[PDB]
Structures are given as structure tokens and as C-alpha cells.
Design a protein around this nucleic acid. Structure first.
Ligand SMILES: [Mg+2]
Ligand SMILES: [Mg+2]
Ligand SMILES: [Mg+2]
Ligand SMILES: [Mg+2]
Ligand SMILES: [Mg+2]
Ligand SMILES: [Mg+2]
Ligand SMILES: [Mg+2]
Ligand SMILES: [Mg+2]
Lengths: 156, 249, 138
RNA sequence: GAGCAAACCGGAUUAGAUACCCGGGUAGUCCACGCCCUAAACGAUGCGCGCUAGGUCUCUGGGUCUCCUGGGGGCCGAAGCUAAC
């Protein structure tokens, strides 16, 4: 089988700490990896050098992926998810609608292989938790609710 | 009274008198429903889950799987090795190391030094520098062996876990489930029967229970499938289980 | 003294499920009893059965969950992931027929209370009526 | 109106001290009636009600009483919450 996707760097930062003598930067990269077929995953590793920072996050990325339930080209249904103070909210849209969302949620949704969405935002427009923000969204989309409400329950 | 179980080993008991002013509390024995350490509550609940668990130990066995047991309390440890070597698998007595499982690709390195050292004290390379390093390599080989004496059978992360007390060796159980590894443990009232994957509601403590639950867990494996061989095992020479084979000094 | 009889029930089910209890009891009453009839026909809860405790009627709602999961935090997914009250007291929310809600894009219901029994977004629309929007479950 | 003590009187320290220190001293602090009404009047967290693991210490009533059931005070903590604490 195959474990290779397409990577996209969301947002990098130098962080600076402080010591006797001066300062000391630590870099932060925020990457998203995806198939465009249902799998995507965020990742943000730090390092004394951006590249490693990216690579690392490239590894943290691929480790935290989430098969997204795409119907046609959209999300099956609606969802709004609370994070730090961010409140991403995605709404399934007809075809030919376009992505339509922020740098972050777009970077993510566009790798999950979506094509038509409308996004809801309402707080801490922080590249980071909006990042995570868009993901639990993608983690909460439903596959088989149809099953859980009507199936038996043996060994729980 | 020692029903043929105690054995008269010239055990004085001169310092063992009850002169320890033990005749002080009347309520000394707050006694409850735990007088010998054999609890089985709800039965239709526990026996149900047992069959469950022990049905897997059998499965993991046959499927060729591996099961490293995890021991940390003095109230076990050694009781973990016997049921260890008897059942060709990896065990952990001494202490867990952060990552034992979530870092294999690195703790396993230690296992490598271990083996590496274990090589050198077999070739002529013995004694080529100051005693200092000679010992520098002995301390290691020694330490390494103390904490890695059982992890040498883990060429790859295991298919299961058998931690005794999924509350005292919780890190173990965390690391485990974080890696989708069915976690098997003893557990009681003072434990997380939610964390334990395949429970066996025995007594977390209590040597006896341990040896009792852990053994069959070892025998069930061993007896995986079967065979003829009907001359039964011998008594007194059951040394291959380990016992105290060959001393050094 | 309760203030909103229903809301009480809904919640009593909500927390109940968050801690994974097997079933919870709630003060009985036609209405609540008719409101649970839906959660039951719809699968959010194995069911309810009139029961007595101390001498006062109560309803045992046998909650329904899912299977245990793999990885950390093995607790079972939820059947009733969300159950809110819409039409609160001193806030009466009645909707027309063309105003009935769609709810969780058909993944969830929305119990209405039309002059024709207690129905769900579906039925109510199917029958062609609207009324107090009691809740929204999914 | 004993003690204390704004203001104020002297003493001393200070580069200078209408201050910290020291010795006195008035309103005041006290009581009565009347007035003022403010406050870090703080748990800095309105009131009531229903629901959601425990453990530990403690005050107070009932109890088949070192155990369970009610009211109140603290501690630690499930789920959950919180920007974090
Ligand atoms: Mg918020
Ligand atoms: Mg938006
Ligand atoms: Mg005087
Ligand atoms: Mg303020
Ligand atoms: Mg009584
Ligand atoms: Mg109390
Ligand atoms: Mg606390
Ligand atoms: Mg918590």
C-alpha cells in the first residue's frame, strides 16, 4: 500500500525565549497533509531551523489524519466547533459553489478534497486553533449515525 | 498451622513474638469482607468477562501474537518472571521507562548496547584499557540488564499487555492504548475498569491471586492448541521454570 | 419547584449520557411521556417504562450509546450527541409549516407539538402543520 | 473620657524632613437620640430550582450509631468548564 500525500505549510513563526545574554528563537511551522480523497491531518512541530520545523510537522502531520466523509464534493452535513475561542462552522454547499473560507480552514478543507463549502467563523481568528478548529469539525462529521440509532449493542 | 504448605524450615520465631504490645487495640481488626483475598462479585458479571478475556489470551496465542506482562509492585515482580520464562515472552519487573512502547525506536537502542556489551565479555577483548572503563562497561551491562532483562524479546511492539494493577502502572496502560494495543490487567474497585481493555477482576495486590490469575494466563497460552504427551510433569525437579538456576559467587 | 418541566427531562438525559449511565429517571407526565415516545421510535434511547420510586411516578429512560472505542479515551460515541430546548417558557417559539426546521441536515429530528399530537420535522411536515417547536435532537 | 490618637507641640535621624523613630496632645475612638450610606460593603463570583464520580477533614440533628440518611463549613478531585489561573 501507499502513504504519500500533498503537503501545505499553513503558517510559520519565530518564537524567541530569553536568557542571560540575549534571546533564543524556536521556530514553528503549521502544516496540513492530504489526499483530496478523504484524508487530511494538521501538525505543528518546533525546531531551531524552519525546515526541520516543517519536516517534523510533516511527520506529526501524517500521524494525525482523519478520513473525511465527503458526499460528492462536500461535507455530508453541518457542524460548528468550538476551540480555544475560535468557532469554525462549515455548511455543506451545492456543486459549483467553490471552497469559500479562511486561509486556514481552506488549507485544510482543500486537502481533505472538498470543493464546495461555506464556512462560519467567530472568534480568536488564530491560525492555530482555527486550524485545529477545522479538524475536529472534520472529525465530527457523521458516518453511520444511521447505524448507531438502530443497531443492537453487544459488548460495550 | 501450616497444612503441609508451611514446611518446618527450623523457623525460630524468637524475634517473631507478639510481645510487640500488639495487645493494644481491641478494634485492631476493623475486619470487613477481605479476610483471605478471594473476591468474586456479581459473578454473572465477572465470570462473563473472564471467559471474555481468557478467550483472547488464547486467540493472541494461536495467532502467534506476543504478550509482554508488566510488573512493578514488590507484591509481584518475581511472580512475573516465573510466569514469564515458563511462557516464552517479554516481561518488565523493575521499572517502566517513559516510552517503553511510545518510543521503541529508541528504547530498543538501549537493548542494543545491552546485547553489544553481552558480546564483548565473550571475546578476547576482555581487558584492553584501564579497569575503569572495564567497569564502565560492567556497570552498564549490569544496569542495562537490570531494566532490560525481558525487553530483549521485543523485536517489535507487542500485540497485548498484562499489567498487574492498571492504576499503579498506569503510564504503561496509557502508552499502550495510545498505540491501539489491547491492554489486559487485573484491576479492582480502586482501578479504572474503563481503561483496562480485557479485565480480569482479581485482587490488584495479594501475591496468591496474582500467581493464580497470571499462571493460567500463562498456561492457557502454552496449552494453545495442544498435543499428546501424557507422562505428566515431575515434582521436585521443576527447575526449568527457572527456580534458582546456577549461582555466581 | 421546576420551572420548565421538559427542559428538565432533556437535560436529565443529557448529563446522564455524558457520564454514560445506563438509564435515568425523570418526573412522569403525558407530555414528557409523549416526547420520549419519539426519542424512542427514533433510536436515541432504547426506551422508557413507567416506574415508581418512593411513591411518586417517574420515567426510566434507558439510554443508548455506541461501542467502546480504540486508542485513548475509549468511551462510546453518543447517540444523543446534542439535545437542546428551543421553545423555552417565556420565549414560546411556534413555527409555521414552511418554518419547520431542517435540523442537522436530516441527521436529527426536531420534535414539534402541533395540534395533531407530538410529531417530528418529518411527520409534521408530511401531515402539513406547524406548532410549538419543543426541541431539536441529534 | 482610662488607654489610644488625625491636627498640633517638642525630641532625633536627614543633604533637607512640615515623614518613617521618640515624648506629649486636641478632635476622635465611648454612650444617648438624630444625620450621613460610603467601602478591596470581595467569595472581587444575584436569587431560586432540577441534574452530573468520588474521596478526605470538620460543625450540627436523625439514625438498626466510629456505617448509613439531612443541613452548614474546608480540603483534594470524575465528567465538564476556562484564555489560563
Ligand atoms: Mg467561548
Ligand atoms: Mg465562517
Ligand atoms: Mg489628658
Ligand atoms: Mg473587574
Ligand atoms: Mg431513624
Ligand atoms: Mg455539604
Ligand atoms: Mg479542585
Ligand atoms: Mg479533567
Amino acid at each position: 500500500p501507499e502513504t504519500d500525500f500533498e503537503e501545505k505549510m499553513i503558517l510559520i513563526r519565530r518564537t524567541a525565549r530569553m536568557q542571560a545574554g540575549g534571546r533564543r528563537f524556536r521556530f514553528g511551522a503549521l502544516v496540513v497533509v492530504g489526499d483530496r480523497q478523504g484524508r487530511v491531518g494538521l501538525g505543528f512541530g518546533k525546531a531551531p531551523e524552519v525546515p526541520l520545523a516543517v519536516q517534523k510537522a510533516g511527520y506529526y502531520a501524517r500521524r494525525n489524519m482523519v478520513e473525511v466523509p465527503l458526499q460528492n464534493g462536500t461535507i455530508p452535513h453541518e457542524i460548528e466547533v468550538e476551540f480555544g475561542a475560535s468557532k469554525i462552522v462549515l455548511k455543506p454547499a451545492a456543486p459549483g459553489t467553490g471552497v469559500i473560507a479562511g486561509a486556514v480552514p481552506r488549507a485544510i478543507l482543500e486537502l481533505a478534497g472538498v470543493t464546495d463549502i461555506l464556512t462560519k467563523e467567530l472568534g480568536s481568528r488564530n491560525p492555530i486553533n482555527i486550524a485545529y478548529a477545522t479538524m475536529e469539525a472534520l472529525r465530527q462529521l457523521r458516518t453511520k449515525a444511521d447505524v448507531e440509532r438502530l443497531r443492537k449493542g453487544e459488548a460495550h | 498451622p501450616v497444612e503441609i504448605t508451611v514446611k518446618e524450615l527450623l523457623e525460630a520465631g524468637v524475634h517473631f513474638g507478639h510481645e510487640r504490645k500488639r495487645w493494644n487495640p481491641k478494634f485492631a481488626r476493623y475486619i470487613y469482607a477481605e479476610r483471605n483475598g478471594i473476591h468474586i462479585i456479581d459473578l454473572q458479571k465477572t465470570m462473563e468477562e473472564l471467559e471474555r478475556t481468557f478467550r483472547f489470551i488464547e486467540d493472541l496465542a494461536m495467532r502467534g501474537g506476543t504478550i509482554l506482562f508488566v510488573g512493578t509492585k514488590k507484591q509481584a515482580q518475581d511472580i512475573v518472571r516465573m510466569e514469564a520464562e515458563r511462557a516464552g515472552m517479554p516481561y518488565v519487573n523493575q521499572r517502566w521507562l517513559g516510552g517503553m512502547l511510545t518510543n521503541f525506536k529508541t528504547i530498543s537502542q538501549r537493548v542494543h548496547r545491552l546485547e553489544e556489551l553481552e558480546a564483548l565479555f565473550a571475546s578476547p577483548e576482555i581487558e584492553e584499557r584501564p579497569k575503569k572503563e572495564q567497569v564502565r562497561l560492567k556497570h552498564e551491562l549490569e544496569r542495562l540488564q537490570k531494566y532490560l532483562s525481558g525487553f530483549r524479546l521485543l523485536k517489535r511492539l507487542p500485540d497485548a499487555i498484562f499489567v498487574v494493577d492498571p492504576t499503579k502502572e498506569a503510564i504503561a496502560v496509557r502508552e499502550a492504548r495510545k498505540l491501539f494495543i489491547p491492554v489486559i490487567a487485573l484491576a479492582d474497585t480502586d482501578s479504572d475498569p474503563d481503561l483496562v481493555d480485557y479485565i480480569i477482576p482479581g485482587n490488584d495486590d495479594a501475591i496468591r491471586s496474582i500467581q493464580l490469575i497470571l499462571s493460567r494466563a500463562v498456561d492457557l497460552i502454552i496449552q494453545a492448541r495442544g498435543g499428546v504427551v501424557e507422562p505428566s510433569p515431575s515434582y521436585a525437579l521443576v527447575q526449568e521454570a527457572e527456580a534458582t538456576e546456577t549461582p555466581e559467587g | 419547584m421546576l420551572t420548565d418541566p421538559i427542559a428538565d427531562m432533556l437535560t436529565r438525559i443529557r448529563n446522564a449520557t455524558r457520564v454514560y449511565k445506563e438509564s435515568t429517571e425523570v418526573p412522569a407526565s403525558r407530555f414528557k411521556e409523549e416526547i420520549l415516545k419519539i426519542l424512542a421510535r427514533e433510536g436515541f434511547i432504547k426506551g422508557y417504562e413507567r416506574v415508581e420510586v418512593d411513591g411518586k411516578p417517574y420515567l426510566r429512560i434507558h439510554l443508548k450509546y455506541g461501542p467502546r472505542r480504540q486508542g485513548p479515551d475509549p468511551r462510546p460515541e453518543q447517540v444523543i450527541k446534542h439535545i437542546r430546548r428551543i421553545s423555552r417558557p417565556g420565549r414560546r417559539v411556534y413555527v409555521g409549516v414552511k418554518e419547520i426546521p431542517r435540523v442537522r441536515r436530516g441527521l436529527g429530528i426536531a420534535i414539534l407539538s402541533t395540534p395533531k399530537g407530538v410529531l417530528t420535522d418529518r411527520e409534521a411536515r408530511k401531515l402539513g402543520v406547524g406548532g410549538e417547536l419543543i426541541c431539536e435532537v441529534w
